[PDB]
Design a protein around this ligand. Structure first.
Ligand SMILES: N=C(N)c1cccc(-c2cccc([C@H](CCCNc3ccncc3)C(=O)O)c2)c1
Ligand SMILES: [Ca+2]
Ligand SMILES: [Ca+2]
Lengths: 235, 91
Protein backbone atom coordinates (compact mmCIF):
# COMPACT_ATOMS: atom_id res chain seq x y z
CA UNK A 1 0.00 0.00 0.00
CA UNK A 2 1.36 3.40 -0.99
CA UNK A 3 0.16 6.09 1.40
CA UNK A 4 -2.71 5.25 3.72
CA UNK A 5 -1.80 3.95 7.17
CA UNK A 6 -1.24 0.83 9.29
CA UNK A 7 -4.44 -0.99 10.36
CA UNK A 8 -5.23 -0.78 14.06
CA UNK A 9 -5.83 -4.05 15.87
CA UNK A 10 -8.91 -5.89 14.67
CA UNK A 11 -9.39 -3.18 12.03
CA UNK A 12 -8.81 -5.17 8.80
CA UNK A 13 -9.56 -8.69 10.18
CA UNK A 14 -10.63 -10.06 6.78
CA UNK A 15 -7.08 -9.72 5.50
CA UNK A 16 -5.40 -12.99 4.53
CA UNK A 17 -1.93 -13.32 3.11
CA UNK A 18 -0.65 -15.90 0.64
CA UNK A 19 2.89 -16.87 1.60
CA UNK A 20 5.23 -18.70 -0.75
CA UNK A 21 7.58 -21.58 0.00
CA UNK A 22 9.83 -19.16 1.88
CA UNK A 23 6.89 -18.01 3.99
CA UNK A 24 7.26 -14.76 2.06
CA UNK A 25 3.90 -13.08 1.61
CA UNK A 26 3.32 -12.61 -2.13
CA UNK A 27 -0.40 -11.79 -2.39
CA UNK A 28 -3.34 -10.76 -0.26
CA UNK A 29 -6.79 -12.33 -0.03
CA UNK A 30 -10.14 -11.76 1.70
CA UNK A 31 -11.50 -14.19 4.32
CA UNK A 32 -15.00 -15.04 3.08
CA UNK A 33 -15.71 -17.63 5.73
CA UNK A 34 -13.96 -20.11 8.02
CA UNK A 35 -13.08 -22.19 4.95
CA UNK A 36 -12.96 -19.95 1.84
CA UNK A 37 -10.52 -17.22 0.79
CA UNK A 38 -11.18 -14.76 -2.03
CA UNK A 39 -8.12 -13.97 -4.16
CA UNK A 40 -7.05 -12.94 -7.68
CA UNK A 41 -6.57 -15.67 -10.29
CA UNK A 42 -3.25 -14.30 -11.42
CA UNK A 43 -1.89 -14.76 -7.89
CA UNK A 44 -2.36 -18.49 -8.40
CA UNK A 45 0.60 -18.34 -10.76
CA UNK A 46 3.22 -16.59 -8.61
CA UNK A 47 4.26 -19.38 -6.23
CA UNK A 48 4.81 -23.14 -6.72
CA UNK A 49 3.28 -23.83 -3.32
CA UNK A 50 1.51 -21.33 -1.07
CA UNK A 51 -0.41 -21.25 2.18
CA UNK A 52 -2.77 -18.70 3.70
CA UNK A 53 -1.71 -16.68 6.73
CA UNK A 54 -4.39 -14.80 8.66
CA UNK A 55 -4.25 -12.91 11.95
CA UNK A 56 -0.76 -11.82 10.93
CA UNK A 57 -0.19 -8.09 11.32
CA UNK A 58 3.61 -7.68 11.23
CA UNK A 59 5.58 -9.89 8.84
CA UNK A 60 8.92 -9.29 10.62
CA UNK A 61 8.15 -9.97 14.29
CA UNK A 62 6.26 -13.13 15.22
CA UNK A 63 3.88 -11.45 17.66
CA UNK A 64 1.75 -14.59 17.35
CA UNK A 65 -2.04 -14.48 17.27
CA UNK A 66 -1.78 -15.67 13.66
CA UNK A 67 -2.05 -18.95 11.72
CA UNK A 68 -1.01 -20.63 8.46
CA UNK A 69 -3.54 -22.82 6.64
CA UNK A 70 -2.96 -25.28 3.82
CA UNK A 71 -5.11 -24.83 0.71
CA UNK A 72 -7.27 -27.93 0.22
CA UNK A 73 -8.58 -26.79 -3.16
CA UNK A 74 -8.19 -23.81 -5.59
CA UNK A 75 -11.17 -22.61 -7.67
CA UNK A 76 -10.05 -20.22 -10.41
CA UNK A 77 -12.35 -18.50 -12.87
CA UNK A 78 -12.25 -20.67 -16.00
CA UNK A 79 -12.27 -17.44 -18.00
CA UNK A 80 -9.18 -15.85 -16.43
CA UNK A 81 -7.10 -14.14 -19.14
CA UNK A 82 -3.35 -13.86 -18.49
CA UNK A 83 -2.82 -11.06 -21.04
CA UNK A 84 -5.66 -8.71 -20.07
CA UNK A 85 -6.16 -10.02 -16.52
CA UNK A 86 -9.90 -10.25 -17.16
CA UNK A 87 -11.80 -12.63 -14.88
CA UNK A 88 -9.10 -12.05 -12.26
CA UNK A 89 -10.79 -13.79 -9.31
CA UNK A 90 -10.35 -17.01 -7.36
CA UNK A 91 -11.48 -18.84 -4.25
CA UNK A 92 -9.32 -21.19 -2.19
CA UNK A 93 -10.95 -23.76 0.06
CA UNK A 94 -8.80 -24.25 3.14
CA UNK A 95 -7.89 -27.64 4.59
CA UNK A 96 -8.54 -26.51 8.15
CA UNK A 97 -11.30 -24.16 9.36
CA UNK A 98 -10.12 -20.68 10.30
CA UNK A 99 -10.82 -19.99 13.97
CA UNK A 100 -12.18 -16.46 13.95
CA UNK A 101 -10.75 -14.26 16.65
CA UNK A 102 -9.38 -10.78 17.16
CA UNK A 103 -7.84 -9.85 13.79
CA UNK A 104 -9.40 -12.85 12.06
CA UNK A 105 -12.99 -12.35 10.97
CA UNK A 106 -14.83 -12.49 7.64
CA UNK A 107 -16.09 -9.73 5.37
CA UNK A 108 -19.69 -9.84 4.19
CA UNK A 109 -20.56 -10.64 0.60
CA UNK A 110 -23.30 -8.29 -0.57
CA UNK A 111 -26.43 -8.95 -2.62
CA UNK A 112 -25.74 -8.05 -6.27
CA UNK A 113 -28.43 -5.50 -7.07
CA UNK A 114 -28.09 -3.78 -3.71
CA UNK A 115 -24.31 -3.54 -3.96
CA UNK A 116 -24.39 -1.74 -7.30
CA UNK A 117 -26.72 0.98 -5.97
CA UNK A 118 -25.80 1.36 -2.31
CA UNK A 119 -22.12 0.50 -2.22
CA UNK A 120 -20.59 0.95 -5.66
CA UNK A 121 -22.18 4.37 -5.79
CA UNK A 122 -20.41 5.46 -2.61
CA UNK A 123 -17.61 8.03 -2.58
CA UNK A 124 -14.87 5.67 -1.34
CA UNK A 125 -13.74 2.15 -0.46
CA UNK A 126 -10.96 0.58 1.59
CA UNK A 127 -8.09 -1.48 0.21
CA UNK A 128 -5.46 -3.10 2.46
CA UNK A 129 -2.37 -5.28 2.34
CA UNK A 130 1.30 -5.89 3.09
CA UNK A 131 2.27 -4.76 -0.40
CA UNK A 132 4.95 -2.24 -1.30
CA UNK A 133 5.00 1.16 0.33
CA UNK A 134 6.16 2.73 -2.97
CA UNK A 135 6.54 1.46 -6.54
CA UNK A 136 10.27 0.95 -5.96
CA UNK A 137 10.19 0.43 -2.20
CA UNK A 138 9.77 -2.83 -0.32
CA UNK A 139 6.82 -4.66 1.28
CA UNK A 140 5.60 -3.10 4.52
CA UNK A 141 6.32 -4.64 7.96
CA UNK A 142 2.77 -4.30 9.16
CA UNK A 143 -0.62 -4.62 7.55
CA UNK A 144 -1.72 -1.31 6.00
CA UNK A 145 -4.96 0.15 4.66
CA UNK A 146 -6.03 2.98 2.37
CA UNK A 147 -9.25 4.81 1.55
CA UNK A 148 -9.50 5.02 -2.25
CA UNK A 149 -12.17 7.10 -4.00
CA UNK A 150 -14.23 5.28 -6.63
CA UNK A 151 -13.37 6.49 -10.16
CA UNK A 152 -15.82 6.52 -13.09
CA UNK A 153 -15.35 3.93 -15.81
CA UNK A 154 -14.97 6.60 -18.49
CA UNK A 155 -12.21 8.47 -16.62
CA UNK A 156 -10.70 5.13 -15.70
CA UNK A 157 -10.62 3.94 -19.31
CA UNK A 158 -9.37 7.24 -20.68
CA UNK A 159 -6.43 6.93 -18.29
CA UNK A 160 -5.58 3.31 -19.03
CA UNK A 161 -3.12 2.13 -21.62
CA UNK A 162 -4.76 -1.26 -21.22
CA UNK A 163 -8.36 -2.27 -21.76
CA UNK A 164 -10.71 -1.87 -18.83
CA UNK A 165 -13.26 -4.66 -19.10
CA UNK A 166 -16.60 -4.55 -17.30
CA UNK A 167 -15.21 -7.11 -14.88
CA UNK A 168 -13.04 -4.25 -13.68
CA UNK A 169 -13.29 -0.82 -12.06
CA UNK A 170 -10.95 2.00 -10.99
CA UNK A 171 -10.30 3.31 -7.50
CA UNK A 172 -7.70 5.70 -6.19
CA UNK A 173 -6.27 9.10 -7.06
CA UNK A 174 -5.17 10.76 -10.33
CA UNK A 175 -2.04 12.46 -8.95
CA UNK A 176 -2.31 12.06 -5.16
CA UNK A 177 0.53 9.79 -4.07
CA UNK A 178 -1.65 6.95 -2.77
CA UNK A 179 -2.65 3.57 -4.21
CA UNK A 180 -2.20 -0.20 -3.88
CA UNK A 181 0.91 -1.97 -5.19
CA UNK A 182 2.63 -5.32 -5.81
CA UNK A 183 2.06 -7.58 -2.83
CA UNK A 184 -1.39 -6.13 -2.22
CA UNK A 185 -2.70 -7.97 -5.28
CA UNK A 186 -5.47 -10.46 -4.55
CA UNK A 187 -6.15 -8.44 -1.43
CA UNK A 188 -9.39 -6.83 -0.22
CA UNK A 189 -11.29 -3.78 -1.42
CA UNK A 190 -14.04 -3.17 1.06
CA UNK A 191 -16.93 -0.70 1.21
CA UNK A 192 -18.67 0.19 4.49
CA UNK A 193 -22.42 0.62 5.01
CA UNK A 194 -23.86 1.30 8.45
CA UNK A 195 -20.61 0.04 9.98
CA UNK A 196 -20.55 -3.34 8.21
CA UNK A 197 -17.80 -4.02 5.64
CA UNK A 198 -18.82 -5.66 2.35
CA UNK A 199 -16.37 -7.19 -0.17
CA UNK A 200 -16.49 -4.91 -3.22
CA UNK A 201 -13.25 -5.54 -5.09
CA UNK A 202 -10.05 -7.55 -5.44
CA UNK A 203 -6.73 -5.84 -6.06
CA UNK A 204 -5.99 -6.89 -9.65
CA UNK A 205 -3.29 -4.67 -11.16
CA UNK A 206 -2.22 -1.18 -12.13
CA UNK A 207 0.32 0.69 -14.26
CA UNK A 208 2.87 1.28 -11.53
CA UNK A 209 1.80 2.67 -8.17
CA UNK A 210 0.42 6.12 -7.34
CA UNK A 211 1.58 7.17 -10.81
CA UNK A 212 0.14 10.53 -11.88
CA UNK A 213 -2.75 10.16 -14.31
CA UNK A 214 -3.35 6.51 -13.38
CA UNK A 215 -5.40 4.58 -10.82
CA UNK A 216 -5.50 1.10 -9.37
CA UNK A 217 -7.57 -1.59 -11.06
CA UNK A 218 -9.81 -4.03 -9.20
CA UNK A 219 -12.03 -6.97 -10.03
CA UNK A 220 -15.67 -5.90 -9.89
CA UNK A 221 -16.80 -8.53 -7.39
CA UNK A 222 -20.46 -7.77 -8.17
CA UNK A 223 -20.02 -9.45 -11.54
CA UNK A 224 -18.95 -12.57 -9.65
CA UNK A 225 -21.24 -12.73 -6.63
CA UNK A 226 -23.22 -15.59 -8.21
CA UNK A 227 -19.95 -17.21 -9.28
CA UNK A 228 -18.57 -16.92 -5.75
CA UNK A 229 -21.56 -18.45 -3.99
CA UNK A 230 -21.26 -21.26 -6.49
CA UNK A 231 -17.62 -21.77 -5.65
CA UNK A 232 -18.42 -21.44 -1.97
CA UNK A 233 -20.90 -24.34 -2.06
CA UNK A 234 -18.21 -26.95 -2.66
CA UNK A 235 -16.61 -30.04 -1.10
CA UNK B 1 -58.61 29.16 16.12
CA UNK B 2 -55.36 27.14 16.20
CA UNK B 3 -57.31 24.66 14.11
CA UNK B 4 -59.26 27.44 12.40
CA UNK B 5 -56.49 27.16 9.82
CA UNK B 6 -56.86 23.37 9.77
CA UNK B 7 -53.07 22.84 9.69
CA UNK B 8 -53.40 19.04 9.38
CA UNK B 9 -53.12 17.13 6.11
CA UNK B 10 -54.05 13.73 4.71
CA UNK B 11 -57.25 13.59 6.77
CA UNK B 12 -55.39 14.05 10.05
CA UNK B 13 -57.24 15.46 13.06
CA UNK B 14 -56.41 18.88 14.46
CA UNK B 15 -56.80 19.06 18.24
CA UNK B 16 -55.90 22.40 19.78
CA UNK B 17 -53.83 21.75 22.86
CA UNK B 18 -52.81 23.95 25.80
CA UNK B 19 -51.53 26.79 23.66
CA UNK B 20 -50.85 24.90 20.43
CA UNK B 21 -52.79 22.71 17.96
CA UNK B 22 -52.15 19.03 17.34
CA UNK B 23 -52.55 16.64 14.44
CA UNK B 24 -53.50 13.00 15.05
CA UNK B 25 -52.25 11.42 11.83
CA UNK B 26 -53.96 8.78 9.73
CA UNK B 27 -52.27 5.44 9.01
CA UNK B 28 -48.99 6.06 7.17
CA UNK B 29 -48.58 9.80 7.74
CA UNK B 30 -46.50 11.61 10.33
CA UNK B 31 -44.89 14.90 11.27
CA UNK B 32 -46.42 17.92 12.98
CA UNK B 33 -49.11 18.22 10.29
CA UNK B 34 -49.10 14.69 8.88
CA UNK B 35 -47.27 16.02 5.85
CA UNK B 36 -44.72 13.19 5.79
CA UNK B 37 -44.96 9.56 4.63
CA UNK B 38 -43.88 6.98 7.20
CA UNK B 39 -43.43 4.51 4.37
CA UNK B 40 -40.09 4.82 2.56
CA UNK B 41 -38.60 2.64 -0.18
CA UNK B 42 -34.99 1.47 -0.39
CA UNK B 43 -34.17 4.76 -2.06
CA UNK B 44 -34.65 6.65 1.22
CA UNK B 45 -32.51 5.64 4.22
CA UNK B 46 -32.17 2.20 2.65
CA UNK B 47 -35.80 1.70 3.63
CA UNK B 48 -34.48 1.58 7.20
CA UNK B 49 -32.86 -1.83 6.64
CA UNK B 50 -29.57 -2.43 8.40
CA UNK B 51 -28.14 -4.25 5.37
CA UNK B 52 -29.76 -5.40 2.13
CA UNK B 53 -32.96 -3.76 0.93
CA UNK B 54 -35.28 -4.57 -1.98
CA UNK B 55 -38.86 -3.82 -2.96
CA UNK B 56 -41.57 -6.40 -3.59
CA UNK B 57 -44.88 -5.03 -4.88
CA UNK B 58 -44.02 -1.42 -4.07
CA UNK B 59 -43.03 -2.59 -0.59
CA UNK B 60 -39.61 -2.76 1.10
CA UNK B 61 -38.19 -6.12 2.15
CA UNK B 62 -34.96 -6.20 4.13
CA UNK B 63 -32.41 -9.01 4.30
CA UNK B 64 -29.03 -9.72 5.85
CA UNK B 65 -25.73 -11.33 4.90
CA UNK B 66 -25.31 -14.94 6.02
CA UNK B 67 -24.47 -15.18 9.71
CA UNK B 68 -27.25 -12.68 10.46
CA UNK B 69 -30.97 -13.00 11.16
CA UNK B 70 -33.42 -10.21 10.39
CA UNK B 71 -34.85 -8.57 13.52
CA UNK B 72 -38.54 -9.17 14.25
CA UNK B 73 -39.20 -5.53 13.34
CA UNK B 74 -38.22 -6.49 9.79
CA UNK B 75 -35.32 -4.07 9.55
CA UNK B 76 -32.42 -4.79 11.88
CA UNK B 77 -29.87 -7.57 11.39
CA UNK B 78 -28.74 -9.56 14.40
CA UNK B 79 -25.42 -11.46 14.36
CA UNK B 80 -26.15 -15.01 15.36
CA UNK B 81 -22.64 -16.44 15.86
CA UNK B 82 -19.52 -14.97 17.64
CA UNK B 83 -17.67 -13.25 14.79
CA UNK B 84 -20.21 -11.97 12.26
CA UNK B 85 -18.87 -10.82 8.89
CA UNK B 86 -18.09 -7.25 7.94
CA UNK B 87 -17.52 -6.18 11.53
CA UNK B 88 -14.17 -5.06 12.92
CA UNK B 89 -12.93 -7.09 15.93
CA UNK B 90 -12.96 -6.07 19.62
CA UNK B 91 -11.15 -7.29 22.75
N1 LIG C 1 -1.40 0.49 -8.48
C1 LIG C 1 -2.10 -0.61 -8.28
N2 LIG C 1 -3.39 -0.52 -8.01
C2 LIG C 1 -1.42 -1.98 -8.35
C3 LIG C 1 -1.88 -3.05 -7.53
C4 LIG C 1 -1.25 -4.32 -7.59
C5 LIG C 1 -0.14 -4.53 -8.46
C6 LIG C 1 0.32 -3.46 -9.28
C7 LIG C 1 1.52 -3.68 -10.23
C8 LIG C 1 2.52 -2.68 -10.34
C9 LIG C 1 3.63 -2.87 -11.21
C10 LIG C 1 3.74 -4.06 -11.98
C11 LIG C 1 2.74 -5.07 -11.88
C12 LIG C 1 2.89 -6.35 -12.72
C13 LIG C 1 1.57 -6.70 -13.45
C14 LIG C 1 1.91 -7.26 -14.85
C15 LIG C 1 0.63 -7.35 -15.71
N3 LIG C 1 0.26 -6.00 -16.22
C16 LIG C 1 -1.09 -5.98 -16.87
C17 LIG C 1 -1.57 -4.75 -17.41
C18 LIG C 1 -2.84 -4.70 -18.03
N4 LIG C 1 -3.62 -5.88 -18.12
C19 LIG C 1 -3.16 -7.10 -17.60
C20 LIG C 1 -1.89 -7.16 -16.97
C21 LIG C 1 3.35 -7.51 -11.79
O1 LIG C 1 2.57 -8.40 -11.46
O2 LIG C 1 4.62 -7.54 -11.32
C22 LIG C 1 1.62 -4.88 -11.00
C23 LIG C 1 -0.32 -2.19 -9.23
CA1 LIG D 1 3.90 -11.93 12.49
CA1 LIG E 1 -54.69 27.12 22.78
Amino acid sequence: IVGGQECKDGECPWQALLINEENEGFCGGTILSEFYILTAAHCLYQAKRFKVRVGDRNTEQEEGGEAVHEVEVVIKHNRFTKETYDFDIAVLRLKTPITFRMNVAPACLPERDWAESTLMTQKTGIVSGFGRTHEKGRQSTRLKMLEVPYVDRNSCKLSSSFIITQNMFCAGYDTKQEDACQGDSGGPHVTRFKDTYFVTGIVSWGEGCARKGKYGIYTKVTAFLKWIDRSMKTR
Amino acid sequence: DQCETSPCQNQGKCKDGLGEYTCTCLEGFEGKNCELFTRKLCSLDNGDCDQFCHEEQNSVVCSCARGYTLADNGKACIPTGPYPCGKQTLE
